[PDB]
Amino acid sequence: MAELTPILPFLFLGNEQDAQDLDTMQRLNIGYVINVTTHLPLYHYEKGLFNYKRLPATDSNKQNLRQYFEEAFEFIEEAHQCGKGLLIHCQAGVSRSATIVIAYLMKHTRMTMTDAWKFVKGKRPIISPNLNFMGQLLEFEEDLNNGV
Numbered sequence: 001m002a003e004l005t006p007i008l009p010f011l012f013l014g015n016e017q018d019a020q021d022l023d024t025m026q027r028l029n030i031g032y033v034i035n036v037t038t039h040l041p042l043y044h045y046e047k048g049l050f051n052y053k054r055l056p057a058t059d060s061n062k063q064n065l066r067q068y069f070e071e072a073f074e075f076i077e078e079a080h081q082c083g084k085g086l087l088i089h090c091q092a093g094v095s096r097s098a099t100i101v102i103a104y105l106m107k108h109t110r111m112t113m114t115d116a117w118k119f120v121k122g123k124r125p126i127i128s129p130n131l132n133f134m135g136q137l138l139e140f141e142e143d144l145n146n147g148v
């Protein structure tokens, strides 16, 4: 039903149609959800199962995602520390969600921007591009290899 592309054993990437698959989320022991949109609903919120973080962003040329980098990392860390998986998603392009996942890999695995990009690409091949987001990731790499 839902490709919940597993980036790491505790970190899953998907689109809106993927976040609407409760069985899959429970099969994979997901307890945390990051919704990187403004307008989509927090699926299954009324069910009392998951914890959530909305990152209110749009697939745009002007959207800043680096602001939400530290937030998303602290949630990823709570899910792992608490031994449960996290699904970060947005919509069809997974452009917004994939930017954040990559950002995580570059900081917490210390990959390069491109090395993480080859890593994510290989697992989920279809990923709408966004040159605005790529620039922020490169800005992030500079800042990680500098200590800032």
Ligand SMILES: CSc1scc2c1-c1nc(SCC(=O)C(C)(C)C)ncc1CC2
Pocket: 094, 095, 096, 098, 099, 102, 113, 114, 117, 127, 128, 129, 130, 131, 133, 134, 137
């Ligand atoms: C960190 S992405 C990266 S790094 C080096 C290259 C690329 C790339 N990416 C994409 S789509 C993925 C995206 O744009 C994001 C939503 C994750 C920002 N198409 C083509 C290329 C060519 C070469």
